[PDB]
Design a protein around this ligand. Structure first.
Ligand code: HEM
Ligand code: HEM
Ligand code: UQ6
Ligand code: UQ6
Lengths: 352, 125, 55, 430, 352, 55, 125
């Protein structure tokens, strides 16, 4: 029950309840998705309808996001209305109704559309494929529900039981008086939650290297590489990603995107080459794997990749900093590879 | 007349043991004279369904009750058209004549009443 | 499809008089409406033939 | 919450709040509304060399990040620093807009940039149907008038553009009297204004831009039928309010009453909007959103929408316009009050994001037009003071029996003729 | 132009023109499928309609099948009508019209339905996955068209040009007088075809071992193994397949199917474990891989697997025989593996 | 949908007289049919009022 | 009258240089007096389309010709309703007035005629 905050002379506050219940810890496939889609439905005292109608008149909205690790229940509002949104978020965590008809009429539709939006963007099909082959059953669990194994209303309830506990969440208010926030959290249903355990395991996730998958796809072709990083060797890969996505690198206009996904215990580096035809995708990645295999750096972005890693303001609550003014060199060891699209015209792992 | 209103009046009678002992026997005898149980129907099968509350309610009925209502209704029409009643061993017994659709109806009426309330809320400064 | 369905005039006849789905259990009390149409026809036909002779 | 603007030889505007990074930039008082039909796209091209691999690597060595935005009334070139490097951003600004403003326009750089804004503007027209439609809305609403020119320029004026056109534009609009230097982030006013009054040298001071002819709304339509697209996308608007209109806020509130919608988001289906009772029964659209767009000379008030229900487009338009009729005759207290609260929330989320580049653009555009920025708390005072009587008097002037402007693309066979749409801008009375 | 035959005192003859143009040799994906679907459309002298109406009155039908290697144009008819069906098959090979509207109205629909039937049977999704990872670009080419890369009418025509040649086909008539058949083939448009080259390469196809793929699927779960075989070591795997699909093996009721696909230059052994839930699929294959790793045989089926390999009558035109009365022992080396279905509940390659 | 569409009687009126899709280019020669309906009405109305006085 | 029949008669005239030199000038002058080219139409745009042959034919038309026919037809209606003709530089020229739909029509008529022939074939033993 870590209750953070930070005041300011502004007018918009934003409460936020982070909860360790993303796809990482998921008993059945997509159940974290369904639960995230179930937030802000009916509680036992307040209907989804009344919540919206009330918050609108006050001047604030709700929103529930899904990560590979976090389910975050956020609330954005006018400053002096704090207690209401604290108790609203409290209500949801403690006592959402989970009516069978809410499942069929609101949650399953909303999830089906989520899966559909993602089913048609081939970098996301790739990113999911990258996770599933590196970490074979941890962070490589499916992000979204697609119905490959049954998930009943009970499974969604059981999972809410595990994940919504005092030990497994952190309240976090931006633009809030810490005094009143802590005061309001302890005086609510938050402090009356069961506090089971947290599944933030310190042990490095076991990832398998030199893995590749090929998915046939009608649309744009995309070839992607993904590299497992260390708990400490991650801040160099961060400058790598920001180097590859900058005018310093000559091969920045040869890729679509490159990023490092930072977690609580390691991370994953991703690189995305995407274009219409398979010829331009083959070349632009065959070059990258050859150019980074004989890699370089010389800390050129060391202040720029510190600029970019700082302008992520929300981050603060931010991990390791001065690891940039440390290592500046980069090789390119073994990685993981996925070809999505015109597959009979894309590189295999052999020839990179 | 809404089922919320029938439930209000009915529950008031059912609790107060003055009325409860006076009326329920009258009501029990009314239900037997009605005769719908001899056709194999439960009362809730008889509710007029051509309105949004009842369509919401029937939509929310679990599969197995839905298939059962369908059979009871079809069986009632066939018996009606032959100008017979069912064999007595096929009649609905009082233990079976449960308000199975009532909770779905009451739930839908409350949801509807709240929307009507919220669409028309006044504000005071 | 069958001509009784596809033709512009016959499809009216088909949907009102031929394929029109009736509840299986309606009794002879539901025969009165056709008897009213019949009555309307009897009144009109006999009235026109009488009008020919009426001042 | 600050607004410190003071004029030395140039006009300097800042707004500081201890955040993390600092953003410095120059914002010129001339945009796509200042171009011609024939050099349309020159500003967008300027933006794109300013962010070219050559200029962008010189900034990334120094640990600086580049940002630019072309609008209708204005134009902005912005560098974000890490906040002690607030001086090395001003170095990059001047090393570009005095020194390198003759080195950025090298033959090989220009041709590789022109080739990239051509693939860019083409991609827009081929695929971005909502913004494509909204851009054509301005085109027909304000035809033969400065606001009709699209911000990205047209493919035909673009491919016929040369280095001398960039030059001639830069020499007429990148002037001192048509400029404001803006700093947002955490850096003080006196921290920046001294680094500016450090170096003198005016550069083309005393030179004014070129005057023009005023923008005007013309009720009209452009219909970009395409039966191969899987949806219809339409935008429809009346003449709205310019910035620094008395009814600037009444208009914005009126748009919040009908708000925006997304059929697939459970929460969105539950909003306190009367229009939603009508459109959800047969699912008349996938989404809509109302807007009050304001510019220097004029604005557009209306809505945009997207739909796969291609045989009931006329019900979409009819129910939406019947709702708008209500603003003149029957809008309720609690609708107005709901809009106040939600207008504050959204205006807040705009003016105070955690991103100084947005703050710079909002500050820059404001001070260029009225010579000052109205504070967020000052806006809320104006918003709270709006009565039902105000909205009615506004709608009766801007909405009731007024001409409209329409644009659409995709499967719009079911979007009825102009006069049918235009007749619904009112109701029959005794 | 190998013209085989074999007479009999029966009434039904069956002409057949085998042609080396299956998915094995395919310039673009599915083009062999489209061409197979284009056979018996319009020629330049005879419409598809007239061909059917004429052959019906005579008393014979046509049919065009697709293999991983062969496109076979077969014709079944009454005996004494031989010349007609020889010239009909001749007409198709030499001069099918390939009208653009036949593509859009008949061929693409028929192919789309083909792909749809196969898209819903999870053993076939597996079998395709097995081929694609063993032989990465030869016999691992997609069998059916699915539109991942463009195929125009021209591509179908170009491919018909390569594949329909005198050197790349074999006429083969069952229940036919070889005298009249050879006489009718040489007197037709068959002998007036260009004779380019044949792509029946003798070199063993390069297959990669220890490969695995996982496809998520709503329906039954199926785990499959696939083993590359030698040109000479294939007749032992044949008895293996017939051993596993017989009452001699104790683990016959633990698998759905097992077979050896014999080609011109090697083969592929396949084993299919398929059931509703993922628990029964995991066990039944985890046992098989463990039971065959400590394998056996002792030639128990050596007359039975010779019975089964003989009752394939059509085969005759049959390869190696007495390789059964030779080797009787079997290990289980490295293979290839695919999990299709409830994937988060199926074995990885590690644990087999 | 709009009431003119949803109502059983009004939808007839809507599909024949209001939303009925006409080719943009029909000229005044296509006005004769409405003039014939008008004629039919004039004949019927004036005939009934005269019938009241006719022997 | 079928296009197969119009083609029969027309081609006979077009080949025999007696008739060919006699008629084509008459036909050329008839086409100019017709006036459809002043509206921006090609003759094949004028063919009545409400029958199965013409629907088959239009279905088989390549995309680019289809979009072009659509524009010419819409432009013709708009000009007709304004009681104008197009600017002369917009008229269809004789070089452009090609029978672009004719081959698709003739193909469909032959296919149809064969089906009718085959559905009605007699047999002799
Ligand atoms: C719904 C239809 C009609 C009804 C209910 C109806 C009813 C009647 C009644 C009650 C009478 C007096 C009967 C009597 O003689 O005691 C009458 C007379 C008459 N009706 Fe009708 N009538 C109908 C239609 C018509 C029509 C369409 C005509 C056509 C001209 C018509 C022509 C006459 C004539 C000529 C008489 C006088 C002869 C007589 O007394 O029967 N009626 N009608
Ligand atoms: C399509 C409808 C009709 C047509 C074309 C029509 C035509 C005519 C004509 C040509 C005449 C003689 C006019 C003359 O006086 O020279 C006439 C007379 C008459 N009509 Fe009709 N008529 C029609 C409908 C009706 C109807 C429904 C009635 C209703 C009773 C009616 C009642 C009469 C009467 C009372 C006369 C004698 C008065 C007179 O001469 O004008 N008519 N009609
Ligand atoms: C869903 O429910 C239904 C249902 O829809 C129907 C149709 C029926 C069957 C009943 C019917 C179809 C009744 C239909 C009849 C009518 C609507 C009649 C309308 C009335 C008229 C008066 C007809 C018009 C007649 C005339 C103008 C008379 C013609 C005059 C002549 C020939 C004069 C001749 C003389 C001379 C000298 C020339 C049902 O039974 C039923 O439920 C069981
Ligand atoms: C696709 O093409 C169309 C199209 O469809 C339409 C509808 C129109 C517009 C034209 C029309 C809608 C014409 C419609 C009119 C009719 C069908 C009329 C039918 C005829 C009648 C005679 C009506 C019935 C009338 C009566 C019984 C008379 C009422 C008598 C009274 C009130 C007696 C009163 C007296 C006393 C004493 C009580 C077009 O113009 C058109 O192309 C451009």
């Amino acid at each position: 029950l870590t209750v953070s905050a930070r005041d300011a002379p502004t007018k918009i506050s934003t409460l936020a309840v982070k909860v360790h219940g993303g796809s990482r810890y998921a008993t059945k496939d997509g159940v974290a998705h369904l639960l995230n889609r179930f937030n802000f439905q009916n509680t036992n005292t307040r209907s989804a309808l009344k919540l919206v109608r009330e918050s609108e008149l006050l001047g604030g909205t709700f929103k529930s996001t899904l990560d590979r690790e976090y389910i975050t229940l956020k609330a954005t509002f006018l400053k002096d209305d704090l207690p209401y949104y604290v108790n609203a978020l409290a209500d949801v965590l403690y006592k959402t109704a989970f009516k069978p008809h809410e499942l069929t009429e609101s949650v399953l539709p909303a999830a089906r559309y989520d899966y559909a939006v993602a089913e048609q963007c081939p970098v996301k099909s790739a990113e999911d494929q990258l996770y599933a082959i590196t970490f074979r059953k941890g962070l490589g669990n499916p992000l979204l529900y697609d119905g490959v194994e049954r998930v009943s209303l009970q499974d969604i309830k059981d999972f809410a039981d595990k994940v919504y506990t005092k030990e497994n969440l952190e309240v976090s208010g931006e633009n809030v008086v810490e005094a009143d926030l802590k005061r309001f959290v302890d005086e609510s249903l938050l402090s009356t939650l069961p506090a089971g355990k947290s599944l933030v395991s310190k042990s490095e996730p076991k990832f398998f290297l030199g893995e590749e998958n090929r998915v046939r796809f009608i649309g744009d072709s995309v070839a992607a590489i993904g590299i497992p990083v260390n708990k400490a060797s991650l801040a160099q890969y961060e400058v790598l990603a920001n180097y590859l996505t900058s005018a310093l690198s000559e091969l920045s206009g040869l890729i679509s995107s490159a990023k490092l996904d930072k977690f609580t215990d390691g991370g994953l580096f991703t690189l995305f080459v995407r274009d219409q035809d398979s010829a331009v995708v083959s070349s632009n990645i065959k070059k990258i794997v050859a150019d980074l295999k004989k890699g370089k750096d010389l800390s050129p972005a060391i202040n720029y990749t510190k600029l970019k890693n700082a302008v992520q303001n929300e981050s603060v609550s931010s991990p390791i900093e001065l690891n940039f003014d440390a290592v500046k060199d980069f090789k390119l060891g073994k990685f993981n590879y996925v070809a999505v699209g015109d597959v009979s015209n894309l590189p295999y792992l052999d020839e990179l | 007349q809404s089922f919320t209103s029938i439930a209000r009046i009915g529950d008031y009678i059912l609790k107060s043991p003055v009325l409860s002992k006076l009326c329920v026997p009258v009501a029990n005898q009314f239900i037997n004279l009605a005769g719908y149980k001899k056709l194999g129907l439960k009362f809730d099968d008889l509710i007029a369904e051509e309105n949004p509350i009842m369509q919401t309610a029937l939509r929310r009925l679990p599969e197995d009750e839905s298939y059962a209502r369908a059979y009871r209704i079809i069986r009632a029409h066939q018996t009606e058209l032959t100008h017979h009643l069912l064999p007595r061993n096929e009649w609905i017994k009082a233990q079976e004549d449960v308000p199975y659709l009532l909770p779905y109806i009451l739930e839908a009426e409350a949801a509807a009443k709240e929307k009507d309330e919220l669409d028309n809320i006044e504000v005071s400064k | 499809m069958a001509f009784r369905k596809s033709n512009v005039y016959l499809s009216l006849v088909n949907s009102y008089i031929i394929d029109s789905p009736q509840p299986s259990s309606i009794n002879y009390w539901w025969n009165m409406g056709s008897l009213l149409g019949l009555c309307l026809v009897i009144q009109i036909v006999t009235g026109i033939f009488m009008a020919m002779h009426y001042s | 919450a600050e607004v410190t603007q003071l004029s030395n030889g140039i006009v300097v505007a800042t707004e500081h709040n201890p955040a993390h990074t600092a953003s410095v930039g120059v914002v010129f008082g001339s945009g796509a509304a200042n171009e011609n039909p024939y050099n349309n796209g020159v500003s967008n091209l300027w933006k794109n060399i300013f962010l070219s691999k050559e200029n962008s690597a010189v900034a990334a060595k120094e640990g600086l990040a580049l940002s630019s935005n072309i609008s209708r009334d204005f134009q902005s070139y912005i560098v974000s620093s890490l906040p002690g490097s607030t001086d090395k951003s001003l170095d990059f600004l001047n090393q570009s807009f005095i020194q390198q403003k003759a080195n950025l326009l090298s033959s090989s750089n220009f041709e590789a940039t022109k080739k990239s804004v051509l693939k860019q503007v083409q991609d827009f027209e081929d695929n971005d149907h909502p913004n494509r439609v909204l851009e054509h809305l301005h085109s027909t609403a304000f035809q033969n008038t400065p606001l009709s020119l699209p911000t990205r320029g047209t493919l035909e004026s673009l491919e016929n553009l040369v280095v001398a056109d960039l030059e001639s534009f830069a020499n007429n609009h990148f002037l001192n009297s048509n400029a404001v230097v803006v700093g947002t982030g955490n850096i003080k006013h006196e921290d920046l204004v001294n680094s500016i009054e450090s170096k003198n040298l005016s550069l083309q001071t005393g030179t004014k831009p070129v005057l023009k002819k005023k923008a005007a709304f013309l009720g009209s339509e452009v219909r970009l039928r395409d039966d191969t697209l899987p949806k219809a996308w339409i935008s429809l608007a009346v003449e709205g309010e310019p910035v620094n209109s008395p009814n600037y806020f009444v208009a914005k509130l009126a748009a919040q009453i009908f708000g925006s919608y997304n059929a697939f988001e459970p929460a969105s289906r539950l909003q306190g909007i009367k229009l939603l009772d009508n459109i959800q029964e047969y699912q008349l659209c996938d989404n809509f959103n109302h807007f009050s767009l304001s510019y220097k000379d004029s604005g557009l008030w209306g809505f945009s929408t997207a739909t796969r229900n291609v045989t009931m487009i006329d019900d979409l338009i009819h129910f939406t316009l019947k709702q708008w009729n209500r603003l003149t005759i029957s809008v309720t207290d609690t609708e107005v009050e709901r809009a106040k609260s939600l207008l504050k929330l959204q205006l807040g989320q705009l003016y105070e994001s955690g991103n100084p580049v947005n703050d710079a653009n909002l500050l820059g555009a404001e001070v260029l037009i009225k010579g000052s920025k109205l504070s967020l708390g000052e806006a809320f005072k104006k918003i709270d003071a709006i009565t039902v009587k105000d909205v009615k008097a506004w709608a009766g002037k801007r909405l009731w029996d007024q001409d409209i402007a329409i644009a659409g693309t995709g499967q719009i066979e079911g979007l009825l003729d102009y006069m049918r749409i235009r007749s619904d801008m009112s109701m029959m009375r005794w």
